[PDB]
């Protein structure tokens, strides 16, 4: 085991090597936003909400999977990183269905909590979304890809924890959807209906 010395907001920490700034700052009672990360399974950081500036860097780095290092200084309250988080927030919100009154999830959707968390007000944008196709042919699970925001947490948990992995990502850009194989339905493949 190796010990790593680093200062966040002027506060010095000794950690085991391999731990990242997210959980180390959580131990120091500091929070960083997350949508992408879940423990032990999904560390890709594709949500691009957990940004923070690191002194001595060309551009910004995401705090989710950035490894710790010796002698580095971390400051989390610059205006630029707040602006970056907000602009990623409206670019997500211009894709993700806005009739959140009649969502099933409704109350404790993570996206509503983050929208109030960054306190964004203006949506100046008009755009075109993904296709609206209802696959109401299965027995247990119905997907509405009009809401899906490409978390890849679902495919990861079906891939490693389940060791079933009947899901994938296809297409380019907007055609990049998570789907079963052969453009079939879940009743048409071997979904376990695990939950």
């Amino acid at each position: 085991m190796k010990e790593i010395t680093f200062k966040i907001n002027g506060q010095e920490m000794i950690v085991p090597e391999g731990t990242t700034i997210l959980e180390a700052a959580r131990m120091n009672n500091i929070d960083i936003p997350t949508l992408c990360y879940l423990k032990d399974i999904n560390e890709i950081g594709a949500c691009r909400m957990c940004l923070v500036e690191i002194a001595g860097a060309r551009a910004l780095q995401a705090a989710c999977v950035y490894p710790v290092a010796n002698g580095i200084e971390v400051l989390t309250n610059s205006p630029k990183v707040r602006e970056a988080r907000r602009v990623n927030l409206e670019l997500i919100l211009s894709n993700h269905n806005r009739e959140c009154t009649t969502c099933i999830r409704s109350e404790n959707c993570e996206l509503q909590t983050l929208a109030t968390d960054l306190g964004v007000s203006d949506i100046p944008f008009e755009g075109e979304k993904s296709g609206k196709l209802i696959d109401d042919l299965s027995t247990s699970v119905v997907r509405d890809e009009s809401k899906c925001i490409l978390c890849k947490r679902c495919v990861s948990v079906c891939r490693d924890v389940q060791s079933v992995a009947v899901l994938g990502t296809v297409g380019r850009g907007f055609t990049s959807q998570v789907q079963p194989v052969f453009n079939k339905s879940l009743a048409d493949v071997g979904c376990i209906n695990c939950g």
Partner: protein, 156 residues
């Protein structure tokens, strides 16, 4: 050019899989010789591959649909290509595209019913120095214009 083997012949597939198992990351290479030998990828063929490898369909189907150099559809006899690079575009290759759509009557990325004329989006063949650049099979025509389009199209 050698004949493309019909899709019902599964023994060549398993022979190539038995040939190319020991190398790491063999998915890309095995898919490209199946592309060379069959011409296109129908579903059962890539499924048998997943049965032979013992790895499920998701990553194979994804890498099939990720690269534009792999096809999910049977294709026509002759391929049609306009070099869509900047060097060919800057001379006015949009006129080439519009004249192709006018003469053939099918849009870009559409295959004619004859199985003979078939068009796609080729970005650069690399011979951008002879713009405009028009490619069909292994034949390239350079420094052209809109006028030469019906005469060259009527060669084949």
């Amino acid at each position: 050019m050698a004949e493309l083997i019909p899709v019902e012949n599964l023994d060549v597939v398993k022979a190539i899989v038995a040939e190319h198992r020991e190398v790491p990351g063999c998915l890309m290479q095995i898919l490209q010789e199946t592309q060379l030998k069959y011409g296109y990828l129908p579903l059962e063929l890539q499924g048998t591959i997943a049965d032979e490898l013992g790895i499920p369909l998701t990553e194979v189907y994804g890498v099939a649909t990720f690269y534009s150099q792999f096809t999910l559809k049977p294709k026509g006899k002759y391929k049609i290509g306009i070099c869509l690079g900047t060097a060919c575009y800057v001379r006015g290759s949009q006129a080439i595209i519009d004249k192709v759509n006018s003469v053939l009557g099918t849009q870009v990325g559409d295959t004619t019913e004859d199985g003979k004329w078939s068009v796609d989006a080729t970005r650069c063949v690399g011979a951008c120095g002879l713009a405009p650049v028009m490619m069909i099979n292994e034949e390239v025509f350079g420094r052209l214009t809109v006028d030469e389009i019906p005469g060259i199209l009527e060669k084949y």
